Structure formats: structure tokens, C-alpha cells
């Protein structure tokens, strides 16, 4: 498969910055695609196409020259509208199905006493959907349990740490309970006190 | 806008002077690839994706050309108003539970980047440049950028940042 990018519409010390983006919004697969291209000059978005509008629109006044221009020429406007299919739908149904949407890394769950408080470190998983719950002797613990936000490692993996305030009495068994789409059955790591 | 997934395709960014540019693809906040503009080569974040899909970097090159053009025209149109520098902020954390004698990866996270030109360099107060990987600039909803710098080392370290809108370099020790 091949990735296609949108076509940046062309126009007609002190530094200056220009940025373009092609945003595709998929809900329920391709059942509802929204496509928005953005033209940003010096961190201020000034022109924008939006599928919901169906034509270019100026966002600041400097956008009127280009919007009105890009709306006037059908070879451009029809192309940008059709990019909702030639870029968004094409990329989702094609290369993303083979890469991003097929990726499944299952997490690494280890428990360790921090000093008291246990830490269930859950690392190196994809995608982002994950459930982590503490049990003490087999009964779900929801008081004294604090989790970080979802931490994005950048290399297409996530990590989350879940700390439980507890007290080690010899005999107790604490278990970390992890649910993830990559796991056929949940992971259960035990820490016997 | 709400969605199950977001594909942010064809992120072209150009700045003058200096003639620095960047072309990237993104899915759900993660970098699929950037096109190296000097070697004219699609560089995938995960080589496996580079074995499962492909992208022609020449499209990145023509899009960069277009954005350079637009940067000229709009640079003139607004009577040459310059980019406004900004204050970037860093945050350091490890990829794995840190284990002495067992290596892993350390992560420095700079944000509120604008314009996209920083020296993300490191502090054993003394420069270390080896076994470091930087990512490319990621796009924020506010059109500033963030960038990660990974440092691999002996689980024995400050992340020094040199931006324009930072009066003096800001070191974020671990």
C-alpha cells in the first residue's frame, strides 16, 4: 500500500514561519470522515478548508485572498474536496489497516514496593486502551490508588504507573489486574506480603 | 472535533531565513514518518511500518516547495511581520523502570516550541551527545510544537534547552 498526502494549495533576526496540515477525523472506521486542511502563518491559522463547509474559508483577513481564490478555481476546490477520499479514506482503508490499526504490543506488568506503597508499572503497550486495577487479598481496591495519566513514550508505546497506598501484613496477597485489547486474557501479577 | 482516530497527513513546515523545513505524517499523535529533505528519503519511525507500507518522499519535496512559496508571498503580504519567540518547557522521565546495570531509555519532553529551532542538548555537568535520539517536531493544537530527546546511558543528568524566547538556557535536572 501507499500513503498519500494532501496537496498544499499554492498562493499567488526577524524570522517567519509557515505551516500546513491535513487532518482526517474517522469515527466508526470510515463511516463518518471529516477532512480539514489548515494554513498557518506565524502560529496564526489564516485559511482553512473544512469538509463540513464544503469550500475554503478565511480565518483571518489575510485569508480572503486565498480562500476566495482557491474557491474560484474548480480544479483546486474539487481536488481538495475529493481529498477526503483520495487521502483520508484511502490512507485509513489502506496503509493504516496494515500498520497503525494492526499494531498490538502487550504490556509489561511488574510490582515493586517503593519504600508504604506498591507500584504497578505497566509499560510498552499499544494501543492506548488499558484498564489497571488493584486487588488486596482478592477484593478490588479503589481507595488510596493513584495512577499517572497516559504517558506517551513517542516510539509508538505507552506506559502507566498505578501506586497503591497499603501496609504489608505477612500473608496478604496484592494483585495488579491489567486489561488490554492485545491480551486474550487479562494479566494478573501478584505480590505476596 | 471528536473522532476515534485522527490522521494528520502532510504536515509541512517552513521557516525563513535559514531555509529549514520539515515534512511528517502522524496517526493518533504518533509519527509515522518524516521525509529527510537533504537525503530525499522517507524515514519511518518504526522500520516495520517501513516494511509494511511506503511513501514517495518526492511528494514531500514538492509540498515543501509549495510551502516555501507561500511563506514568501505571505511574508510580503503582511508587511513582513516577524515570528514572535516563545517560552519552551521541558519534562524528564524514563521509558522503563530504571534498573542499575540494566540499560534503558531516558526521555526529555520540550513543549511550547515556536519557532521550531532549538538546541536540545544534555548535562555529570559536562556535554554528552552520544547515544541520543531526537524526534522531529510534533504539531500542537495551538500551532506551537513539542519535541522529545532520548538519552541512553548507564543507570547512574540535566536536559539543557537553548531556544530564542528563553533569555538564558534552562536546565531541567533529574
Amino acid at each position, epitope marked *: 500500500v*501507499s500513503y498519500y498526502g494532501p*496537496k498544499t494549495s499554492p498562493v499567488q533576526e526577524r524570522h517567519f514561519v509557515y505551516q500546513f496540515m491535513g487532518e482526517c477525523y474517522f469515527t466508526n472506521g470510515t463511516q463518518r470522515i471529516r477532512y480539514v486542511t489548515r494554513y498557518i502563518y506565524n502560529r496564526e491559522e489564516y485559511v482553512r478548508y473544512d469538509s463540513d463547509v464544503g469550500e475554503h474559508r478565511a480565518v483571518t483577513e489575510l485569508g480572503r485572498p486565498d480562500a476566495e481564490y482557491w474557491n474560484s478555481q474548480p*480544479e483546486i476546490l474539487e481536488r481538495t474536496r475529493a481529498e477526503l477520499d483520495t487521502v483520508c479514506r484511502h490512507n485509513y482503508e489502506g496503509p493504516e489497516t496494515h500498520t497503525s490499526l494492526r499494531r498490538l504490543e502487550q504490556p509489561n506488568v511488574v510490582i515493586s514496593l517503593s519504600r508504604n506503597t506498591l507500584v504497578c508499572s505497566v509499560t510498552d503497550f499499544y494501543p492506548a486502551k488499558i484498564k489497571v486495577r488493584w486487588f488486596r487479598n482478592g477484593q478490588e481496591e479503589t481507595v488510596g490508588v493513584s495512577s499517572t495519566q497516559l504517558i506517551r513514550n513517542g516510539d509508538w508505546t505507552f506506559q502507566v504507573l498505578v501506586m497503591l497506598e497499603m501496609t504489608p501484613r505477612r500473608g496478604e496477597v496484592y494483585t495488579c489486574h491489567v486489561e488490554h485489547p492485545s491480551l486474550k486474557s487479562p494479566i494478573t501479577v501478584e505480590w505476596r506480603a | 472535533i471528536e473522532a476515534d482516530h485522527v490522521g494528520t497527513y502532510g504536515i509541512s513546515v517552513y521557516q525563513s531565513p535559514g*531555509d529549514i523545513g520539515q515534512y511528517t505524517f502522524e496517526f493518533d499523535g504518533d509519527e509515522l514518518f518524516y521525509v529527510d529533505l537533504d537525503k530525499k528519503e522517507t524515514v519511518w519511525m518504526l522500520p516495520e511500518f517501513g516494511q509494511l507500507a511506503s511513501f*514517495d518522499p*518526492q511528494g514531500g519535496l*514538492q509540498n515543501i*516547495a509549495v510551502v*516555501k*512559496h507561500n511563506l514568501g508571498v505571505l511574508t510580503k503580504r503582511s508587511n513582513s511581520t516577524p515570528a514572535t519567540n516563545e517560552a519552551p518547557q521541558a519534562t524528564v522521565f524514563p521509558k522503563s523502570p530504571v534498573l542499575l546495570g540494566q540499560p534503558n531509555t531516558l526521555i526529555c519532553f520540550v513543549d511550547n516550541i515556536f519557532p521550531p529551532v532549538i538546541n536540545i542538548t544534555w548535562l555529570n555537568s559536562k556535554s554528552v551527545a552520544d547515544g541520543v535520539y531526537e524526534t522531529s517536531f510534533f504539531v500542537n493544537r495551538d500551532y506551537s510544537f513539542h519535541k522529545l530527546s532520548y538519552l541512553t546511558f548507564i543507570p547512574s543528568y540535566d536536559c539543557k534547552v537553548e531556544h530564542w524566547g528563553l533569555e538564558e538556557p534552562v536546565l531541567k535536572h533529574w
Partner: T-cell receptor
Amino acid sequence: AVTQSPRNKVAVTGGKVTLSCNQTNNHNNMYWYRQDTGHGLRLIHYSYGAGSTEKGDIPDGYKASRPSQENFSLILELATPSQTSVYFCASGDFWGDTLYFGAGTRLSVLE
Amino acid sequence: QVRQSPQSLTVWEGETAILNCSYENSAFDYLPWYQQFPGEGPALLIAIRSVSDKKEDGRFTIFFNKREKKLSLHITDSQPGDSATYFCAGIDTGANTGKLTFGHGTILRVHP
């Protein structure tokens, strides 16, 4: 208009030839082609803008130079009989449906 | 690779010349025909998009067939002024690259 220069040229092997192309369409893309019986038109080098040159399908033997938006030049440092051909320069807009060719240059490289 | 047939075609005035073209890449979505007069450089004659099964331009017509990836140019009421080399080209416009892939051309000689 897209005009080339020179339009005819005879050279000896091992000499340096410089075909040179000028365009006044305010186009951004510029291409260098050669035409030969049994091979059609073949891309040698092209360019998306000033300062950049991209390799075509048959770039060996030639270097390209785009010093400005209206000038695209093709250079043979060690001219060779196999480089005897008819060369055509083209221009095009960004995402353009049309290439605009020049009139051509006939070049012979002789032992 | 684009493949054109026949390599030479000779026609009498008023006949209908048919230049045939076939390509391999399924991703080609834009196919233009360039006309080259002797001593000149080629110029865009007529082009069709993959989404259309045709293109009418006066006496020149493009019949496109996407399933077979086959292409054909019909020149009706051929005039001796149509004697020229015709090239079939194809590009995947989605790749944003701007390289047409040219065929080898058919030399059309129209007898007066």
C-alpha cells in the same frame, strides 16, 4: 515561453557541454528530457524550485543546476557518444496537468 | 511502463486513426496524450482522468477502460496536418511527485 539554448551543438568526447533552459511562465517545476528512437522521452533531472534538483530515471552522466526560478541548466562534464541525442526542457505549475516543452536541442558527441 | 501500439500508423485523409496504449500500474489516475510535430517539442493534445470512461475534444477522442487498463485515441476525419508523433503518458497524481511516465509514441503519417 520555454526556450532552450543552444539548439544545435557538436562536441568531442571528454568535453564539457552545458545545455541551458529558460522559462517565463512563472512555473515552479522544471524538467530535462532526452528523446531517442526505441526509448521515447526519458527524464534526466528535474526541480521543484530554486536551489533544488532531483534525480530522474537516467541521471548518470549529467548534473543539473537550478540557480533561480526561471533558469534550469543541464551539464555534461565528460561528454560521451552515448549522450548524443535530442534534449527537451519542460516547465510546469505545482500539481499541473500540463508540461510545457521547449523546441529542443540536437547534440552530437563524436570521437 | 507504458506500452503503445502500433509503432507506425499510415492513414489516408478522412479516415479514422486509432492509437492504442496500455499501462501496468493500477494507480495511474491521469493519462494525457502529447502531440509532437517534426522539429518541434511535444505539446498537450488531450487528457483523461481515470474516473471518466472518455474525453471528447473535437475530432480527437479518448476511450479509456480502467478494468483492462487500456487506452485509445481516435482521430476522426484525419487531416494531413495531423501527421506527428503521439505520446501516451500516465501518472499517479496521489504521489504528489510530478513525473509523467511516457510511452514510446506512435508515428502517424496521414496521406493527402
